[PDB]
Amino acid sequence: QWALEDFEIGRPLGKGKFGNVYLAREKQSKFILALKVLFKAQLEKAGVEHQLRREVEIQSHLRHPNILRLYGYFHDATRVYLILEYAPLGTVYRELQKLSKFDEQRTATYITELANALSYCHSKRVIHRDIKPENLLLGSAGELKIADFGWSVHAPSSRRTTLAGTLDYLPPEMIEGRMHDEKVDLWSLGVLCYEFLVGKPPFEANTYQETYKRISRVEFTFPDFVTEGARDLISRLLKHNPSQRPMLREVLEHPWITANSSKPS
Ligand SMILES: Nc1ncnc2c1ncn2[C@@H]1O[C@H](COP(=O)(O)OP(=O)(O)O)[C@@H](O)[C@H]1O
Ligand SMILES: O=C1NC(=O)[C@@H]2C[C@@H](c3ccccc3)CC[C@H]12
Ligand SMILES: [Mg+2]
Ligand SMILES: [Mg+2]
Secondary structure, three states, rough: OHHHHEEEEEEEEEEEEOOEEEEEEEOOOOOOOEEEEHHHHHHHHHHHHHHHHHHHHHHOOOOOOOEEOOOEEOOOEEEEEEEEEEEEEEHHHHHHHHHOOOHHHHHHHHHHHHHHHHHHHHOOOOEOOOOOOHEEEEEEOOOOEOOOOOOOOEEEEEEOOOOOOOOOOOOOHOOOOOOOOHHHHHHHHHHHHHHHOOOOOOOOOOOOHHHHHHHOOOOOOOOOOHHHHHHHHHHHOOOOOOOOOHOHHHHHHHHHHHHOOOOOO
C-alpha cells in the first residue's frame, strides 16, 4: 500500500535510539502526520525486530484519547516507516526543561490522564514498561498522550532483551531481571509524579551502578516544598513489593489527585 513517494517530508520532530521522527504530509489528502524512520541495518544489528512488531501490533489496536494512534507502516529495503498521529505541542520532557518544575494542578492533571490511559491498557493486560517524559506527547489541547510502545508486552513477563539506556524509571523487579507484571507501570507513575513536582527523578545518580543501588534499596527523600498529600501518593507507588502498590482506581481517587486535577476519571 503506502510508500515513501506518497509523502512530503518536513522538519525533524525528534530522535530516538532507532527512531528518527519527521513531520510529513500525505500528498493526496494533505493529511499531516508523524513518520518514524528506522534503519534496517541497525534493527538487524541490535536484533530488535520482535519489539518493532509488538509496537505496531499493540499500539494499532488501542483506541483511547490519551494514547497516541498508529495508523500503519511500510518498508523499502533500507528502512522501516511507522505512520503516527502527529502531536503538535511536543513532549512533556521539553515542557519540563522549559519550566524546571510543574505546580500541583499541572502534575495532578497529567497523572490523571496517565492513569486513565494505563487503566485502559491494563484492561487488555498490556504493560507499557517505558513510561518516561520523552515518550509522553501533547495534543492540540495540551492533553497528555502515551507513545513509544516499543517495549510493551502482555503480562506476566520476563525480560528477553538488554536494557540500553537509563535505569531511572524501572522498578526493582525489572532491573534485577526477575519476573514482572502490570505493577511495573505503577512504579513508573510514582517516579514521574516525583519528577514532575521536583524537577528530577528520585533515584538519579552519576553512574549506572549507583542508580541501580538507589532503586533496589528504594532510597529517595523529598524536598521541603513537596506537600503531605503528594508525599503520601508517591510513597504508596514506590513500594519495593509490587503487590503493595495501589490499583489505578485508588490512584484516580486519591484525595490529593481529586483536589488538584482539572480532569476526571
Ligand atoms: N507523533 C509524534 N509527534 C511529535 N513528536 C514525536 C512523535 N513521535 C515521536 N516524536 C519525537 O521523537 C522522539 C522519538 O520518538 P520515539 O517514538 O520515542 O522513538 P524511540 O523508539 O527511538 O524512543 C520523541 O521523544 C519525540 O521527541
Ligand atoms: O527487515 C525488517 N526488519 C524488521 O525489523 C522489520 C520487521 C517487519 C515488520 C512487520 C510488521 C510490523 C513491523 C515490522 C518488516 C520487515 C522489517
Ligand atoms: Mg522513545
Ligand atoms: Mg523504541
